[PDB]
Design an enzyme around this catalytic site. Structure first.
Site, PDB file in Angstrom:
ATOM      1  N   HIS G  72       0.879  -1.191   0.016  1.00 46.86           N
ATOM      2  CA  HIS G  72       0.052   0.110   0.034  1.00 46.86           C
ATOM      3  C   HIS G  72       0.868   1.282  -0.030  1.00 46.86           C
ATOM      4  O   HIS G  72       0.477   2.412  -0.621  1.00 46.86           O
ATOM      5  CB  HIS G  72      -1.054  -0.025   1.107  1.00 46.86           C
ATOM      6  CG  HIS G  72      -1.778   1.306   1.293  1.00 46.86           C
ATOM      7  ND1 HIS G  72      -2.923   1.380   0.233  1.00 46.86           N
ATOM      8  CD2 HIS G  72      -1.741   2.368   2.393  1.00 46.86           C
ATOM      9  CE1 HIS G  72      -3.314   2.565   0.617  1.00 46.86           C
ATOM     10  NE2 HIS G  72      -2.775   3.239   1.735  1.00 46.86           N
ATOM     11  N   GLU G  75       2.203   2.239  -3.532  1.00 47.50           N
ATOM     12  CA  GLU G  75       1.327   3.603  -4.460  1.00 47.50           C
ATOM     13  C   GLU G  75       1.361   4.818  -4.103  1.00 47.50           C
ATOM     14  O   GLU G  75       0.751   5.474  -4.734  1.00 47.50           O
ATOM     15  CB  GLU G  75      -0.115   2.710  -4.598  1.00 47.50           C
ATOM     16  CG  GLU G  75      -0.909   2.788  -3.380  1.00 47.50           C
ATOM     17  CD  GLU G  75      -2.309   2.084  -3.419  1.00 47.50           C
ATOM     18  OE1 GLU G  75      -2.843   1.560  -4.735  1.00 47.50           O
ATOM     19  OE2 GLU G  75      -3.151   2.214  -2.687  1.00 47.50           O
ATOM     20  N   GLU G 152      -3.692  10.597   9.199  1.00 50.91           N
ATOM     21  CA  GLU G 152      -5.027   9.918   8.960  1.00 50.91           C
ATOM     22  C   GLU G 152      -5.179   8.768   9.765  1.00 50.91           C
ATOM     23  O   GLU G 152      -6.338   8.334   9.676  1.00 50.91           O
ATOM     24  CB  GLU G 152      -5.010   9.544   7.365  1.00 50.91           C
ATOM     25  CG  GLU G 152      -4.234   8.585   6.859  1.00 50.91           C
ATOM     26  CD  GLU G 152      -4.507   8.318   5.406  1.00 50.91           C
ATOM     27  OE1 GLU G 152      -5.248   9.050   4.855  1.00 50.91           O
ATOM     28  OE2 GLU G 152      -3.893   7.348   4.834  1.00 50.91           O
TER      29      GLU G 152
END
Ligand code: HEM
Ligand code: HEM
Ligand SMILES: CCCCCCCCCCCC(=O)SCCNC(=O)CCNC(=O)[C@H](O)C(C)(C)COP(=O)(O)O
Ligand SMILES: [Zn+2]
Lengths: 50, 122, 50, 59, 45, 441, 464, 48, 54, 88, 82
Positions: G72, G75, G152
């Site tokens: 992940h 990307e 986040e």
């Protein structure tokens, strides 16, 4: 082992296996169930008890 | 047998008119209509069809029901000037209830149940 | 929908927030009363026979 | 199935050792070398029917 | 029609089994004796 | 048991495409259009796709609304494809769900569209369902009364986005007439709505010369021959309130808007009728694309902006090309200054690489809009309703044949025309309105 | 009765033969390079756009505990500059071909693809190979993305459905590789670097695990030549480190379990119940597709939910049990997941749970033929809708070559769907659902969700 | 209006009726009550 | 759902099936059920004895 | 009906085309009226014989050997059928 | 005409030839049809034959399961000779 050569015919007339073009087992032995029921009723009415 | 069907047709129509006349004469003493006899607690199709009506019609129906229940409690009838205006065969619920029943018949032929249940108070 | 507007969590790296953002596959149960079977043990349970 | 070392062999080498050991076994099941000759020819031919295979799944 | 070697094996096995059945049949007791013995079994119910 | 064939293995030979391939056509199919004897125009384009899309475009929308029938297009989006004179709601829902087809009702600012998408084997069923649900719709009292709630939350959710509200107020400020009416109205506008209001709106908008049947992947001769008895319409054309561009400025007060939104717009002369002006407006929209998300997780940083969102709408006879930019509440004057600087630098000239990039962006958008069958059917129907023809090839030729001098002349003619200016948010910092509309003069 | 408005159409569900749709569907050509990379195209005759990309049989399953989250993070990093092109150079060159690059990273699959026009096929091939092979993986960009991911994570910035499904995968696949999240834990992000990214790409991005799939307007021979020029330098794979050896070495395990994520002042109550489903290669996966169509899905912006064919949709829409729900059928290399996910609140959560359990167990006993014919027609129509978009055609080409090993023809797929009947549905429901353990996951206002014994009791009926 | 009113209105179709499998599964409870009664009474070898 | 249609099913379900109870109750909280069972036993055996007592 | 024992041109053409496309080597778009078998469709003599037999099955015909030998293209077969009063 | 219609060339199946009265397979449509008198007479004759066989067999089952020798020797031993 390839077999798809020269106008494969199975697929050409595969439509012959139409479900309504098949042998129906629903009506393969018609009237048999009613005959069996009548035979059972006759046996129970005549031979079994009396 | 459609011959005899049409045959009862007029005997059926005659008994229907005679019954409706007698009951409507009994109905008009309380101010009630024929459609006021249908009960949502008794019939869920009536309960759904009554939900499809504009609110002024429901208010008028509830007023007629309360007037008739008050008259029954008093053991009285309408006054003659008021009794002459009564129209017990005027329909407000018939087309709505007919369409509800047709919908329930059409759903039942495909296996679907009615999208409304009975009314429960608990 | 977003979890900040729906669940409305507190901000921080608390123990509950860490498992909320990334749960672990190494779940530890309490084994003082019952010891677990090996994970992924297949078959209809023996407790029906008992 | 082969052994783990043979599992590590290159595709070319894996198939080569497969064919070699197959010939060895055919000798081992043979009554004689003379019986083994036509079996050897047939075994060579059978691989010849797989020379032009490309899809690695079927391979 | 169809060529099933399974049918051939079945034919041979049936031949052998029926020969054995014939041999079994050859040495059976008398039907009179069998009936009387069964009536003994029928007389104790 | 049942089938036990592993999917890595081929399934048995009776899983064959023995039905042979239809020969492909020599050329790319062309759009063929005609008119029914009732006056309804029918246009269709053949495709090699196995999906046939049928859409019915009716002139209307917010431009045909009155103060009495306010918000009727949004209600018609929900209330469509319900009980007709021939079928109940249950029967139409089951007939759509039996063939796996999908239906939509979509209301624009000058049209309403109804469509059914299905496979190529069920195009007659889709056409019959669409025609029956449009022409013979009943709009019963109880169904509209029960749909009004869902209409209220859909409008309340659509007004949560500030760009929708800015677009509404911008269309109000830019135009007087039909195009200035509000599409996404407040939820309390439709609080007194009934089925009589919707029936009145439908009776106003429906007329044979205002209805276009568009199809994708359908033979044209078959479609006209089987839609002639279905789209025999009668009615009178309710007068259309033709809109005019006047410009101006306004404001919006939002109590809990964490950002501040500024809209700037100009008029695209000629509307959707002129191919070249619409192409130049699309190129200008692409030239205003500052932060286009062409890659995942890319962080383009602007000094003042938080979001930039241009647009180019092309209505009948007139258009509205412009840009909406966000920003911090304390930096709204900086947002205005940066937007004016961007439009002025566009007027100062475009430099080759930017022109080629914007032309490629416009061509990519134009070709990706008509890639699928429902998108192609919608494009054909909207173009035939607005103009009378579909000219995607001519639009592509106009996009490709555009020079930098023509674009610079277009922006120069744009900045002379009076603009439209809309703000949004808990506005606690703003330059005065007279100096706002001075920098282009 | 209207003469023209009442022909051709009726609400009685009957089987439809989709055989004439097969005459014009295009063909897929596959070419295997000496690298081991497959090049597969599907040319649509008058297409103007092209979707093309690289599909990789790798993802979060094939990581370890130490580097969980590397795929992940890749990307985030890969589009930030290569060794031949900078950030602005890549941005300008992508803008000039009029398309957008995109990336997805699953538990077992990864794709990087481009949606361009037909004139920009070679440029898209060159750009995709440039990011895939010659990336910078700069430490400054890694530090510039680590802090954003950490913010986040601290904010708990996540979708509710993704939160529930990650909890579901974590509790259903305990102590197996499929129980890890794609995002990874906080500590691996706090201690990530360029070396782990290089090692992951070197280990897993190899020839036999990579498919270059293109659909739309594309020539097969030219894409073969371009792929041999560009992607010809990828390493081959050792036989001992193949995908099958890794699947055998760390297998999936299903455990019947329960988790809820309780919040003190939440409004919604999201919940998912799943059973152990089928792998991709199981022949029972087609009846599970039909059963998932039979269960369907619904959200409350629709107003025709009471006239639905599906009985679960009818029950939820009529009684108002949920704001939205959907039935899912997830397939992996050696296991799967089948069940229903929904959103409700705390006062309707038990009745929604009962509706889910009662409709799942009902498919073992009573299945009528009209529902099966309807679901077969809907599933075949849904498969025809994916043929309309070249993005879905390319995605299906990549997925089918990665997980089936071959391109399943449309005639075989229609024949395999048409072989499903009510007895097959009853048998598959008996195999997977009846008296089996399930996995339960919930999040939000979940104080009134029933515990595990309530869910376990309702997987069977005592009345038959 | 539950009972004969349901069949007078046409609400009892060939559909919405129990299937043959449903009736067989319900009909399989006939042997359970027979076996339970024979277990409770135990009239061993009482069959004529 | 089926207990929502009859009152007697609803009362029984609420007060016997789905009634919330503290999870840490020990075996000192069994005296009430045992007392009820002993009352039922006393009533049954007494009713049976009353058919022979004078 | 129509024809003195003969069928229409059009259904014959459609049936012949539908039969023709039953080969893996054949691309559909290249089959058309009066098409060369060998030069155009690239079908061997075995394929031509198979097609003759298949058309005999489709139309229920027992074609004489010499006439079958004359068959070498789509148009020839179609016109031959258009001469048959014995074709169904 | 023919109870089976053949479509060929993937032609769109005629709408008039679709419905519950038409069932298609491989593009070829056959009709679901029922005949009252034929089925009724078939059921009558089949039931007659079945009952005939059943009753004739039940009247003569002992003379089949055991042999005539066995049955009659059993009768002689058990139920006298005269
Ligand atoms: C025939 C006699 C009785 C029956 C059937 C009965 C039944 C019950 C039951 C079922 C409970 C709930 C669970 C439990 O605590 O066991 C309970 C609780 C209770 N009972 Fe009894 N009971 C009886 C007599 C009594 C007597 C004689 C007293 C006191 C003088 C009493 C006082 C209580 C109290 C205070 C509680 C609540 C305790 C708690 O929940 O912590 N009961 N009873
Ligand atoms: C409907 C309920 C009851 C009935 C009909 C009933 C009836 C009787 C009868 C007829 C006797 C005399 C027979 C004998 O002495 O063995 C008896 C004895 C007795 N009963 Fe019950 N009874 C009932 C419930 C109870 C209850 C609730 C108690 C509670 C403590 C109780 C305590 C006794 C006692 C202590 C004796 C004396 C036993 C002895 O020493 O022989 N009975 N009962
Ligand atoms: C019950 C069965 C009884 C036995 C039946 C007979 C079985 C034995 C069959 C084996 C013997 C043969 O194949 S017979 C040998 C046939 N092959 C040749 O003679 C070599 C090729 N020569 C040519 O002229 C052409 O290629 C040609 C292919 C002929 C024409 O094809 P085209 O015109 O397209 O070009
Ligand atoms: Zn992530």
């Amino acid at each position: 082992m390839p077999k798809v050569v020269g106008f494969q015919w199975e697929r050409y007339e595969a439509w012959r296996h139409h479900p309504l073009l098949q042998f129906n087992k629903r009506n393969a032995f018609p009237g048999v169930g009613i005959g069996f029921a009548a035979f059972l009723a006759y046996v129970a009415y005549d031979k079994s008890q009396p | 047998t459609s011959l005899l069907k049409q045959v009862a047709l007029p005997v059926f129509n005659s008994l229907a008119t005679t019954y409706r006349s007698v009951v409507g004469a009994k109905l008009a003493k309380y101010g009630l209509r024929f459609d006021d006899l249908q009960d949502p607690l008794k019939d869920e199709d009536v309960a759904e069809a009554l939900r499809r009506l504009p609110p002024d019609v429901v208010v008028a129906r509830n007023c007629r029901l309360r007037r008739a229940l008050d008259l029954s409690c008093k053991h009285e009838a309408l006054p003659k000037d008021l009794l002459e205006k009564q129209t017990p065969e005027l329909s407000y619920l018939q087309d709505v209830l007919n369409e509800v029943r047709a919908e329930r018949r059409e759903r039942a032929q495909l296996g679907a149940p009615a999208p409304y249940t009975r009314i429960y108070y608990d | 929908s977003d979890a900040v507007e729906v669940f409305k969590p507190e901000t921080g790296l608390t123990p509950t927030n860490r498992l909320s953002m990334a749960p672990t596959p190494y779940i530890k149960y309490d084994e003082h009363n019952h010891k677990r079977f090996p994970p992924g043990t297949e078959g209809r349970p023996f407790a029906y026979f008992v | 199935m082969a052994s783990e070392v043979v599992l590590a062999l290159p595709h070319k080498l894996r198939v080569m050792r497969m064919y070699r050991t197959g010939l060895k076994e055919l000798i081992n099941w043979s009554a004689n070398r003379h019986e083994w000759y036509p079996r050897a020819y047939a075994l060579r031919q059978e691989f010849e029917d797989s020379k032009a295979l490309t899809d690695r799944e079927e391979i | 029609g169809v060529f099933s070697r399974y049918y051939n094996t079945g034919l041979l096995c049936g031949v052998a089994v029926a020969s054995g059945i014939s041999i079994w049949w050859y040495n059976r007791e008398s039907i009179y004796v069998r009936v009387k013995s069964d009536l003994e079994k029928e007389g104790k119910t | 048991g049942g089938g036990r064939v592993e999917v890595p293995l081929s399934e048995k030979l009776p899983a064959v495409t023995e039905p042979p391939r239809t020969s492909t056509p020599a050329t790319k199919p062309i759009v063929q259009t005609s008119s029914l004897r009732s006056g309804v125009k029918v246009a269709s384009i053949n495709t090699v796709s196995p999906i046939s899309s049928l859409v019915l475009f009716v002139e209307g929308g917010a431009a045909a609304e009155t103060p009495a029938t306010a918000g009727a297009s949004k209600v018609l989006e929900v209330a469509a494809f319900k009980a007709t004179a021939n079928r109940s709601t249950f029967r139409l829902t089951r007939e759509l769900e039996k063939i796996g087809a999908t239906s939509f009702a979509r209301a624009g600012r000058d049209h309403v569209a109804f469509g059914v998408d299905a496979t190529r084997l069920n195009q007659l069923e889709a056409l019959e369902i669409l025609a029956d649900a449009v022409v013979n719709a009943r709009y019963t009292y109880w169904e509209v009364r029960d749909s009004l709630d869902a209409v209220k939350e859909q409008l309340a959710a659509q007004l949560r986005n500030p760009l929708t509200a800015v677009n509404e107020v911008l269309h109000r400020t830019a135009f007087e007439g039909g195009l200035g009416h509000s599409l996404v109205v407040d939820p309390s506008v439709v609080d007194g709505f009934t089925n009589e209001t919707l029936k009145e709106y439908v009776h106003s908008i429906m007329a044979p010369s205002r209805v276009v049947l568009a199809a994708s992947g359908v033979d044209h001769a078959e479609l006209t021959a089987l839609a002639t008895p279905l789209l025999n319409l009668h009615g009178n054309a309710h007068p259309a309130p033709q809109s005019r561009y006047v410009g101006g400025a306004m404001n919006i007060i939002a109590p809990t808007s964490s950002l501040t939104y500024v809209g700037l717009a100009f008029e695209a002369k000629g509307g959707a009728g002129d191919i070249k002006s619409s192409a130049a407006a699309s190129v200008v929209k692409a030239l205003l694309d500052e932060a286009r998300p062409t890659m995942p997780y890319q962080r383009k940083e602007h000094e003042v902006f938080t979001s930039v969102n241009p647009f180019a709408f092309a209505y009948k006879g007139t258009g509205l090309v412009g840009v909406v930019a966000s920003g911090a509440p304390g930096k709204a004057g900086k947002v205005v200054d940066a937007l004016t600087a961007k439009v002025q630098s566009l007027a100062k000239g475009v430099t080759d690489v930017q022109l080629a990039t914007a032309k490629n962006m416009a061509l990519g958008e134009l070709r990706a809009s008509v890639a699928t069958a429902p998108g192609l059917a919608a494009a054909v129907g909207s173009s035939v309703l607005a103009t009378g023809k579909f000219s995607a090839n001519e639009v592509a030729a106009a996009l490709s044949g555009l020079t930098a001098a023509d674009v610079t002349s277009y922006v120069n003619a744009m900045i002379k025309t009076a603009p439209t200016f809309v703000t949004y948010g808990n506005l606690s910092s703003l330059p005065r309105v007279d100096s706002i509309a001075k920098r282009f003069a | 009765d209207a003469n023209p408005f009442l022909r051709f159409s009726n609400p009685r569900p009957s089987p439809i033969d989709h055989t004439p749709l097969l005459s014009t569907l295009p063909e897929t050509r596959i070419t295997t390079l000496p690298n081991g990379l497959r090049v597969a195209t599907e040319a649509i005759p008058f297409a103007e756009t092209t979707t093309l990309g690289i599909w990789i049989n790798s993802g979060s399953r094939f990581e370890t505990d130490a580097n969980n989250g590397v795929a992940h993070f890749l990307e985030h990093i890969l589009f930030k500059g290569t060794k031949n092109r900078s950030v602005k150079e890549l941005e300008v060159e992508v803008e000039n071909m009029g398309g957008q690059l995109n990336a997805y990273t699953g538990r077992e699959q990864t794709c990087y693809y481009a949606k361009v026009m037909g004139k920009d096929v070679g440029k898209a091939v060159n750009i995709l190979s440039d990011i895939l092979l010659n990336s910078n993986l700069d430490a400054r960009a890694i530090d510039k993305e680590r802090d954003v991911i950490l913010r986040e994570m601290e904010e708990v910035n996540k979708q509710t459905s993704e939160l529930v499904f990650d909890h579901l995968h974590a509790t259903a696949f305990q102590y197996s590789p499929l129980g890890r999240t794609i995002l990874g834990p906080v500590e691996n992000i706090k201690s990530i670097n360029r070396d782990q990214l290089v090692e992951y790409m070197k280990t897993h991005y190899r020839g036999p695990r990579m498919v270059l799939a293109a659909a739309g307007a594309v020539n097969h021979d030219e894409l073969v030549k371009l792929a041999s020029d560009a992607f010809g330098s990828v390493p081959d794979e050792d036989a001992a480190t193949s995908v099958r050896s890794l699947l055998v070495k760390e297998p999936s395990r299903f455990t019947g379990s329960y988790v809820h994520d309780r919040f003190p002042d939440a409004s919604e109550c999201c919940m998912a119940v799943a059973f152990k489903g089928a792998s991709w290669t199981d022949p029972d996966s087609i009846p599970l597709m039909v059963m998932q169509t039979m269960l369907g899905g619904w959200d409350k912006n629709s107003t025709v939910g009471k006239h639905s064919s599906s009985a679960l949709v009818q029950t939820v829409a009529t009684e108002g049990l949920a704001d939205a729900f959907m039935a899912f059928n997830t397939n992996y290399h050696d296991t799967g997941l089948f069940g229903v996910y929904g959103v409700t609140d705390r006062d309707r959560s038990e009745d929604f749970a009962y509706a889910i359990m009662s409709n799942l167990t009902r498919m073992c006993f009573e299945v009528r033929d009209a529902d099966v014919a309807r679901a077969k027609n809907q599933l075949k129509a849904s498969l025809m809708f994916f043929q309309d978009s070249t993005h879905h055609v390319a995605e299906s080409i990549g997925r089918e070559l990665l997980v089936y090993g071959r391109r399943i023809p449309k005639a075989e797929m229609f024949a395999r769907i048409d072989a499903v009947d009510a007895n097959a549905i009853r048998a598959v429901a008996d195999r997977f659902i009846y008296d089996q353990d399930m996995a339960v996951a919930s999040a939000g206002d979940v104080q009134f969700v029933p515990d595990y014994n309530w869910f376990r009791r309702r997987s069977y009926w005592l009345r038959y | 209006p539950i009972g004969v009113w349901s069949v007078f209105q046409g609400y009892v179709t060939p559909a919405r009726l129990p299937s043959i499998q449903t009736l067989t599964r319900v009909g399989a409870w006939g042997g359970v009550v027979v076996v339970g009664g024979l277990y409770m009474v135990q009239p061993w070898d009482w069959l004529a | 759902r089926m207990h929502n249609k009859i009152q007697l099913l609803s009362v029984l379900n609420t007060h016997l099936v789905a009634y919330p109870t503290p999870m840490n109750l020990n075996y000192s909280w069994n005296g009430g059920s045992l007392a009820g069972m002993m009352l039922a036993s006393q009533m049954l055996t007494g009713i049976l004895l009353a058919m022979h007592y004078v | 009906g129509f024809g003195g024992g003969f069928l229409d041109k059009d259904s014959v053409t459609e049936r012949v085309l539908h039969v023709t496309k039953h080969f893996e080597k054949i691309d559909a778009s290249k089959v058309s009226p009066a098409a060369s078998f060998e030069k155009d469709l690239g079908l061997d003599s075995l394929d031509v014989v198979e097609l003759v037999m298949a058309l005999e099955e489709e139309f229920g015909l027992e074609i004489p050997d010499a006439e079958a030998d004359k068959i070498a293209s789509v148009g020839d077969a179609i016109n031959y059928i258009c001469s048959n009063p014995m074709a169904k | 005409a023919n109870a089976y219609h053949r479509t060929y060339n993937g032609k769109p199946v005629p709408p008039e030839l679709q419905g519950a009265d038409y069932i298609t397979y491989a593009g070829v449509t056959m009709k679901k049809e029922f005949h009252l008198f034929d089925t009724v007479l078939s059921k009558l004759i089949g039931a007659g034959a079945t009952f005939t066989c059943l009753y004739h067999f039940y009247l003569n089952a002992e003379e089949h399961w055991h042999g005539d020798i066995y049955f009659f020797e059993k009768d002689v031993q058990q139920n006298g000779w005269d």
